[PDB]
């Protein structure tokens, strides 16, 4: 929330943020149990707090231009993913009414970023390899004056992740306003292995 972190972190705002930390610990933590004694308005409370957890994440990935992992039925990008224990997952699915989807598209195999040949030369000689060497050549010794912008270089930030086959992936999807987060509980993975989730 930028409205407290706007001033510049003097003494008299951190001594306020510590009291705000304590007030959010005393009241708003452990929010699944405040919904069971809520009575009737539990779905609104849980759907508020999940969206509040989402929007308070500065999710500015530099790879946010990569159109990976969209939802299957609609076509919206899946921005963000939840991880829960399996005991709370059914209560989350019943409290949030029903899923809007049962599968999401995504990359089928890992993108291959390999050492190319000019990369191999600078690998042997100095030992320092960049990501996209031919792209650096195109931006330096071919057209350096070309002012590259967001529509111009969006293939270069997506190292092959964008053209690879999109298979479905079975995962529960919920909808929080315009953002569509997909929930998953991998507790089945651990309980057959006797390690603590």
């Amino acid at each position: 929330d930028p409205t407290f972190t706007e001033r510049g972190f003097s003494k008299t705002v951190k001594s306020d943020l510590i009291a705000m930390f304590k007030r959010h610990l005393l009241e708003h933590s452990f929010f699944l149990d405040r919904a069971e004694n809520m009575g009737s308005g539990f779905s609104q409370y849980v759907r508020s707090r999940l969206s509040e957890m989402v929007a308070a994440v500065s999710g500015e990935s530099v790879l946010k231009g990569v159109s990976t992992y969209t939802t299957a039925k609609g076509g919206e990008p899946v921005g963000g993913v939840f991880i829960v224990t399996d005991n709370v997952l059914r209560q989350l699915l019943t409290f949030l009414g029903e899923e809007a989807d049962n599968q999401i598209m995504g990359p089928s195999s890992y993108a291959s970023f390999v050492v190319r040949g000019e990369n191999l030369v600078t690998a042997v000689s100095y030992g320092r390899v960049m990501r996209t060497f031919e792209h650096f050549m195109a931006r330096i010794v071919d057209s350096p004056e070309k002012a590259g912008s967001t529509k111009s270089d969006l293939p270069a930030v997506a190292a092959g992740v964008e053209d690879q086959p999109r298979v479905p992936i079975s995962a529960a999807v919920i909808k929080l306003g315009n953002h569509a987060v997909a929930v998953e509980s991998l507790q089945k993975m651990y309980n057959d292995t006797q390690s603590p989730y």
């Binding site: 929330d1 409205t3 407290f4 001033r7 003097s10 003494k11 008299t12 705002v13 001594s15 306020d16 705000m20």
Partner: protein, 217 residues
């Protein structure tokens, strides 16, 4: 340096824009009790003797929300403090005296031959903060606050000063848009350790209905 000029001009006759407060993000003032010392307000003034003066000055500890003290008798009923009123024991209203004059405004705000504007039956609640030579003006009015440090934000100064009492008693539209467009009611600071008063305009952002209404909660 990149220069740019622009000249706006108001087209609607009446007000064309409203500001409404909506939410309270953080009560930033750390609202407790910490009264400031008068010995930083008046570091020069002292008693006759030196050693008893230093004894008292060491006893009270004279060396982040600032309170001040208005002295009142014990015979004030709690009903005056129940309703949100003016803290000087007198209903300091701005409009039941006439606008653009000084006789009847000083008569309603300081003379006690006319009774209080709120109650039908009493002149004031305390006579130590409503007279023309009371304790409240001798503490906080600017006419007797000379050789005092500017930059302290004594909060009770806004409930007493004569310049605000003349500034509010202009035309009401003139009063409200000069309240909005100029934020200078000699207010507090924004984020410092102790509350200073601000000097440069359009840097920090603060308004007060306290100097608009002369009441308190």
């Amino acid at each position: 340096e990149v220069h740019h000029e622009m000249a706006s001009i108001d087209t609607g006759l009446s007000y064309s824009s409203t500001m409404t407060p909506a939410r309270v993000a953080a009560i930033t003032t750390d609202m407790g009790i910490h009264t400031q010392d008068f010995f930083s307000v008046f570091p020069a003034e002292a008693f006759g003797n030196q050693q008893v003066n230093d004894y008292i000055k060491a006893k009270v500890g004279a060396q982040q929300a600032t309170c001040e003290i208005i002295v009142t008798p014990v015979t004030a009923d709690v009903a005056y403090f129940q309703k949100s009123n003016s803290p000087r024991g007198r209903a300091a209203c701005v409009v039941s005296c006439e606008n653009y004059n000084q006789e009847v405004a000083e008569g309603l705000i300081y003379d006690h031959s006319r009774p209080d504007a709120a109650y039908e039956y009493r002149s004031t609640v305390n006579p130590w903060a409503s007279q023309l030579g009371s304790l409240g003006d001798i503490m906080y009015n600017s006419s007797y606050r000379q050789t005092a440090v500017p930059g302290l934000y004594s909060p009770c100064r806004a409930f007493f000063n004569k310049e605000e009492l003349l500034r509010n008693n202009r035309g009401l539209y003139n009063m409200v848009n000069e309240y909005s467009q100029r934020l200078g009611g000699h207010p507090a600071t924004s984020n410092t350790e102790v509350q200073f008063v601000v000097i440069a305009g359009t840097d920090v952002f603060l308004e007060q209905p306290c100097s608009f209404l002369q009441e308190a909660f």
